Amino acid sequence: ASTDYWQNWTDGGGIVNAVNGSGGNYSVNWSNTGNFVVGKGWTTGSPFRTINYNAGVWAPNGNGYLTLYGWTRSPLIQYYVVDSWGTYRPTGTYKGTVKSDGGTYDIYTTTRYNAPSIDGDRTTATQYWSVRQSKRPTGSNATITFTNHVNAWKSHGMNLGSNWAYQVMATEGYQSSGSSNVTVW
Ligand SMILES: [Zn+2]
Ligand SMILES: [Zn+2]
User: How many Cβ atoms from other residues are within 10 Å of residue 20's Cβ?
Assistant: First the structure.
């Protein structure tokens, strides 16, 4: 059930060369950036979606995340499933672990002031994280069975909102350079 959403946001710092490729493909080549989020996915996320991707390039030089990225409203909550990163492994308040798709993820919560909002304005964001304990190998087809994460979060008292905004497989960077090329389906 194909992607229908193109995410491309930058704070304006540095160079963020994002290409919206055919189908579910995109690429980013970025240099000395502020914060940016680029990805492909769906306009209306679902807690039951299996996200398929293949990162044919994952080459951050500094802080970049290769991550599921989405939001709910009512209440407003941002969520991440981070499969790989660059020089920084994102963490927060430790909640527990979840096993999914061949990997083990630590579960964290954070609250970020002046965080990017759904539309690239700002907000105080309540964030739920699953962060893989080691960087996922890239270049082969990969699955994120998102219901495993949703169910794990719920069991640890982390409930999502009733209204679903977009749900993308993203490259997020901060204060970094790099290259990524990802196809999502
Ligand atoms: Zn648990
Ligand atoms: Zn806004």
Answer: 12
How far does Cα 71 stand from its chain's mean position? Answer: 10
Residue ranges making up the domain that contains 28: 5-184
Ligand 2 centroid vs 119 CA: distance in angstroms? 5
| Count of domains forming the chain | 1
* CA angle, residues 46, 5, 124, in degrees to nearest 5: 70
Output the CA 46–ligand 2 centroid distance in Å: 22
8 Å CB contact between 170 and 37: yes
* Residue 165: partners with Cβ closer than 8 Å, 6 or more residues away: 44, 45, 70, 71, 72, 73, 118
| Technique used to solve these coordinates | X-ray
Resolution given for this structure, in angstroms = 1.7
- What residues are neighbours of ligand 2 (ion), with CB under 5 Å? 119, 121
DSSP-derived secondary structure letter, 140: S
Domain CATH for 96: 2.60.120.180
Q: What are phi and psi of 175, to 5 degrees?
A: 55, 50
Q: Counting ligands in written order, which one lies closest to the CA of residue 165?
A: 2
From the CA of 152, the nearest ligand is 1
